[PDB]
Amino acid sequence: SMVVAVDGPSGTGKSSVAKELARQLGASYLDTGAMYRIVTLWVLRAGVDLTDPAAIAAATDQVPMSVSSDPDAQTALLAGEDVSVPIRGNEVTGAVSAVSAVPAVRERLVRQQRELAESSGAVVVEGRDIGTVVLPDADVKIYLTASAQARAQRRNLADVQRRDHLDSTRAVSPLRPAEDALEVDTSDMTQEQVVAHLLDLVRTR
Amino acid sequence: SMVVAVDGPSGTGKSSVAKELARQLGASYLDTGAMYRIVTLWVLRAGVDLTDPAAIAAATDQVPMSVSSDPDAQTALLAGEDVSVPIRGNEVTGAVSAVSAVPAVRERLVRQQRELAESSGAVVVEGRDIGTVVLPDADVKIYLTASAQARAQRRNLADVQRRDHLPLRPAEDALEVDTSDMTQEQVVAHLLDLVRTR
């Protein structure tokens, strides 16, 4: 049925907006960022050497991950343990792009996200490369964005502009919107206004 | 005074041995591996992206690290917090080589390890490249080694064979000791004899 991709950089209130959109659409929601983070957690706890992509691959064949498609019940389960809290931690934020860079890690997660998408009917799928790579035949592709200065504001600065330069420059999955994505600049919007706007965009199309 | 370097792979019980060697010599002790692990903790808690070496470099300009040279009182301090327990954790074991591979990071730490070795007098310095890179003019250089099988046996095997395959080899003037069939206290006695005779 109807697939909404929501992509863009972090610190735009992206997740909260995507979930609320889902609810308002009567639809399911999938936090794909959280899946990478669950795998990252499992890798950190296994004490795997992060400079060795082969050890990372080998240690992630059977990641006991379980996530929810309900915007009202988002638990991150790892081996039946609620890891919602640790996966948002600074250590996992540190290690997450190293773990996600591994071709074998992405390949399993891209597959899971796609099965979970079909599995869900009406669904809003949030991430970074949902419109481009994961669900390129999404019906509506939303790209949420804001100035470096507005995201710096919502965070508390110079680290967000470095992560901007790097995410543009990266060799593996650089951040860019899909050719047919609808770019919404949320610098001067509130969250409920961003929701209202995306519902209009979705309802129009 | 007298510098003793103790290098070697992991899983040989090297640390317990160098500490005791230090005690029996009346000497100071420096765990250099811990110093790398303290920096890694800091980087992890700061959430620096481990694939950005320049970010790692800038996040480590002023690491508030303090370690002891007393083999009987090893506490790892990070900004006055005792982190002896976390720096041993798996998260840190996972990230330690990515942080340590950043030249700015090694550069500061090698310098500190040399000043700490300088001001400590008679000292045993544990590491993986002490004899080759950190203290090449060390008086006695020891390199502790053991069969893939012995190291495997201590821990529990597959991840020791890979980590051996994938500076860290003994210095020219390093004395190699294969501990495969020796107990800890025999290793210590052995090293005392090497140190005493030299």
Side-chain angles (χ1 to χ4, degrees), chain B residues 16-31:
Chain B
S16 195
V17 163
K19 281 177 197 64
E20 185 57 26
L21 177 58
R23 308 186 180 99
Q24 295 297 310
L25 286 168
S28 293
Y29 165 75
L30 196 49
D31 186 341

Side-chain angles (χ1 to χ4, degrees), chain B residues 1-105 107-152 158 160-161 164-165 167 170-171 173-197:
Chain B
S1 302
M2 168 161 302
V3 178
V4 182
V6 182
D7 294 298
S10 39
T12 66
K14 171 170 65 80
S15 278
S16 195
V17 163
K19 281 177 197 64
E20 185 57 26
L21 177 58
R23 308 186 180 99
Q24 295 297 310
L25 286 168
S28 293
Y29 165 75
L30 196 49
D31 186 341
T32 66
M35 306 174 71
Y36 294 89
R37 287 172 170 273
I38 287 152
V39 181
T40 302
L41 195 60
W42 177 255
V43 174
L44 292 185
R45 294 171 159 188
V48 173
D49 183 338
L50 292 176
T51 73
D52 190 359
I56 303 171
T60 57
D61 271 350
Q62 306 282 349
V63 182
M65 171 216 297
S66 157
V67 303
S68 155
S69 60
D70 187 340
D72 292 318
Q74 292 289 290
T75 292
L77 297 180
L78 193 52
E81 206 213 324
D82 169 6
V83 295
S84 307
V85 173
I87 63 151
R88 293 318 163 167
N90 283 4
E91 297 88 10
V92 184
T93 292
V96 73
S97 68
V99 167
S100 307
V102 186
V105 169
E107 154 158 296
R108 314 180 183 103
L109 279 195
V110 170
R111 185 177 55 228
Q112 292 158 227
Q113 285 159 10
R114 304 166 159 165
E115 302 185 8
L116 279 202
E118 140 217 81
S119 75
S120 286
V123 63
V124 176
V125 188
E126 188 187 347
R128 291 192 83 199
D129 57 2
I130 306 318
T132 39
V133 185
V134 196
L135 302 172
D137 305 301
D139 306 285
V140 181
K141 287 173 190 191
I142 300 293
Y143 184 93
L144 290 174
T145 199
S147 56
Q149 315 89 73
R151 282 173 287 154
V160 181
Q161 301 163 302
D164 284 346
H165 180 271
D173 50 336
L175 297 135
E176 275 181 71
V177 188
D178 188 303
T179 67
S180 303
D181 267 336
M182 309 179 71
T183 71
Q184 145 150 21
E185 66 182 289
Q186 290 167 346
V187 184
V188 163
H190 185 82
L191 299 187
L192 278 161
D193 177 80
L194 284 178
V195 176
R196 280 150 184 186
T197 61

Side-chain angles (χ1 to χ4, degrees), chain A residues 5-17:
Chain A
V6 184
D7 298 295
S10 55
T12 59
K14 218 223 297 151
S15 285
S16 169
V17 160

Side-chain angles (χ1 to χ4, degrees), chain A residues 43-52 90-95 97-99 101 162 166 170, chain B residues 43-52 54-55 90-95 97-98 101:
Chain A
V43 175
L44 287 183
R45 288 165 165 197
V48 172
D49 190 314
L50 298 169
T51 57
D52 190 0
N90 274 1
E91 303 83 358
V92 171
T93 300
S97 295
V99 169
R162 169 79 179 161
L166 222 80
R170 263 171 55 137
Chain B
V43 174
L44 292 185
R45 294 171 159 188
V48 173
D49 183 338
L50 292 176
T51 73
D52 190 359
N90 283 4
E91 297 88 10
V92 184
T93 292
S97 68

